[PDB]
Design a protein around this ligand. Structure first.
Ligand SMILES: COC(=O)N[C@H](C(=O)NN(Cc1ccc(-c2ccccn2)cc1)C[C@@](O)(Cc1ccccc1)C(=O)N[C@H]1c2ccccc2C[C@H]1O)C(C)(C)C
Lengths: 99, 99
């Protein structure tokens, strides 16, 4: 589909058996979701945005579905104010910027 | 053009007769640039990101070129880690997300 940017590009994602709303963010290196439980091992990581850094848990090889498109990748979990889908997963669903 | 997301979508912009590198950020509502000088009076604004909020200076009706596409709009200036082109200007250049 073609998503305009008049409003924030929010979409529904399916992860860990849960349905969440997330922001398609081309300015995000990684994908970070609000506090939730995920299977497997994890490693701590510090990620920085405007305002500074926050500590998150890093889970690798996590299955996720965005707008019907299945993908696998690293998912960070921590105190983010909004669910963000970053470039690591946007590439997998074939998302591109056009103008 | 069509920009993939395997790497950061960094582009060249021109403002105040100077070239700068900026990030095309669909997750950003506004456009914020690193400390610089701009004409006219500015208004106060607080913008929130991953690690919190930062105070910025808001300048309106500023001429800015993005990838050669001329735009005229609001540009924020403050302690941002990187130059960010947000939806206010992405919409002016006709940028959309596609997959
Ligand atoms: C590489 O780091 C990242 O990719 N960081 C990502 C990141 O923060 N990305 N970017 C730009 C941005 C880009 C780089 C840096 C940064 C900071 C320190 C060192 C190196 N880079 C900071 C902000 C900004 C993000 O879109 C992320 C975001 C989205 C939604 C809610 C909160 C935060 C954002 O900050 N959006 C806000 C913004 C930006 C400019 C003007 C107004 C506004 C309002 C908001 O729209 C992250 C943490 C999701 C994975």
């Amino acid at each position: 589909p073609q998503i305009t940017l008049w409003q924030r590009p929010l979409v529904t994602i399916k992860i860990g058996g849960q349905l969440k709303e997330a922001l398609l963010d081309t300015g995000a290196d990684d994908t970070v979701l609000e506090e939730m439980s995920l299977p497997g091992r994890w490693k701590p990581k510090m990620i920085g945005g405007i305002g500074g850094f926050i500590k998150v848990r890093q889970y690798d090889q996590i299955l996720i579905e965005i707008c019907g498109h299945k993908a696998i990748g690293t998912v960070l979990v921590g105190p983010t104010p909004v669910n963000i889908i970053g470039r690591n997963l946007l590439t997998q669903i074939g998302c591109t910027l056009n103008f």
